[PDB]
Amino acid sequence: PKSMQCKVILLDGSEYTCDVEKRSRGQVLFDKVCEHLNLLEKDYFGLTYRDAENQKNWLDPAKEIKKQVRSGAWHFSFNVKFYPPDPAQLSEDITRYYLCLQLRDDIVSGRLPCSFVTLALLGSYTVQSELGDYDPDECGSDYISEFRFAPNHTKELEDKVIELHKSHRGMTPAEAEMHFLENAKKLSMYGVDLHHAKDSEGVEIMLGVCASGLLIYRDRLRINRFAWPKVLKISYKRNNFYIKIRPGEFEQFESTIGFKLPNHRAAKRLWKVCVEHHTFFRLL
Ligand SMILES: O=C(c1c(F)cccc1F)N1CCCC1
Ligand SMILES: O=C(c1c(F)cccc1F)N1CCCC1
Numbered sequence: 001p002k003s004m005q006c007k008v009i010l011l012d013g014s015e016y017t018c019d020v021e022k023r024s025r026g027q028v029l030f031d032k033v034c035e036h037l038n039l040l041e042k043d044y045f046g047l048t049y050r051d052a053e054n055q056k057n058w059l060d061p062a063k064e065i066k067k068q069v070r071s072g073a074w075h076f077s078f079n080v081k082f083y084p085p086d087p088a089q090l091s092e093d094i095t096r097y098y099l100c101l102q103l104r105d106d107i108v109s110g111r112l113p114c115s116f117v118t119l120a121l122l123g124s125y126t127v128q129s130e131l132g133d134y135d136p137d138e139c140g141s142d143y144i145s146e147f148r149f150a151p152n153h154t155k156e157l158e159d160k161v162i163e164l165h166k167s168h169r170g171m172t173p174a175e176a177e178m179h180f181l182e183n184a185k186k187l188s189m190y191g192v193d194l195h196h197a198k199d200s201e202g203v204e205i206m207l208g209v210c211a212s213g214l215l216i217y218r219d220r221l222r223i224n225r226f227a228w229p230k231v232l233k234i235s236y237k238r239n240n241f242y243i244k245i246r247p248g249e250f251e252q253f254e255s256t257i258g259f260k261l262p263n264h265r266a267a268k269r270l271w272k273v274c275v276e277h278h279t280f281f282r283l284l
């Protein structure tokens with residue numbers, strides 16, 4: 001039996017290495033990673049890899065790893081795939097913990113925009129969870145934390161983190177993580193996977209895929225929202241991605257909205273993530 005070495009970037013930034021038989025399906029590797037992480041609530045998570053364009057793709061657990069990664073290194077990242085709309089309802093604290101680590105990267109990367117105050121409050125719960133109670137000995141007026149809190153750090157943000165940290169005395173890691181999640185879950189881009197596309201008139205838009213449905217971000221004025229119940233059908237033809245919407249209260253027939261993606265692969269990627277998210281909605 002010939003086995004390929006796999007390297008997986010974990011959400012703390014560390015690297016897990018293991019081997020799987022070269023014709024292994026993605027589920028085999030994913031099961032090894034989740035056992036390493038002591039993670040039972042595995043359905044919210046998945047593995048990604050980067051193609052020769054360094055675009056992120058979901059490893060399909062049902063298909064051979066080799067057929068997916070094709071010519072690339074067997075190098076993967078462990079990630080949240082389906083962001084729970086109510087993290088309080090997860091059965092395990094360790095699940096909430098990995099969700100926190102993913103959200104911390106969502107914030108630092110700018111995928112999850114956040115007000116100054118929310119950056120500081122989230123940062124304060126992270127510090128409380130990671131270091132425990134506020135200690136003045138480690139923090140002077142000049143203090144800068146090792147923790148990355150934001151896409152751009154300022155001394156003002158570091159000060160606000162410390163001020164809110166002082167208020168969390170006695171909070172345990174699981175409690176601080178639950179508070180982190182209660183705040184993060186409310187942010188407008190929480191759990192939203194964004195895809196570049198053009199509308200039928202060729203105007204640049206963004207399509208967001210999340211638990212609740214599909215978002216079309218046309219401009220700061222006019223964000224189209226299609227709850228899953230409203231989406232009849234989704235399709236991809238060549239580079240074209242089409243959404244069919246149930247008849248409105250004044251339509252007799254469904255409406256078809258068409259989008260142009262960069263290439264055929266980007267259309268197929270968007271279709272698959274939409275199908276997978278809709279099934280998630282169906283089981284909520
Ligand atoms: O076209 C759809 C679909 C969707 F993805 C969202 C809502 C309604 C639908 F018919 N599917 C194709 C594969 C299974 C789901
Ligand atoms: O069974 C699924 C699921 C999956 F296993 C693959 C793709 C889409 C899904 F909804 N889930 C249960 C809880 C979270 C997702």
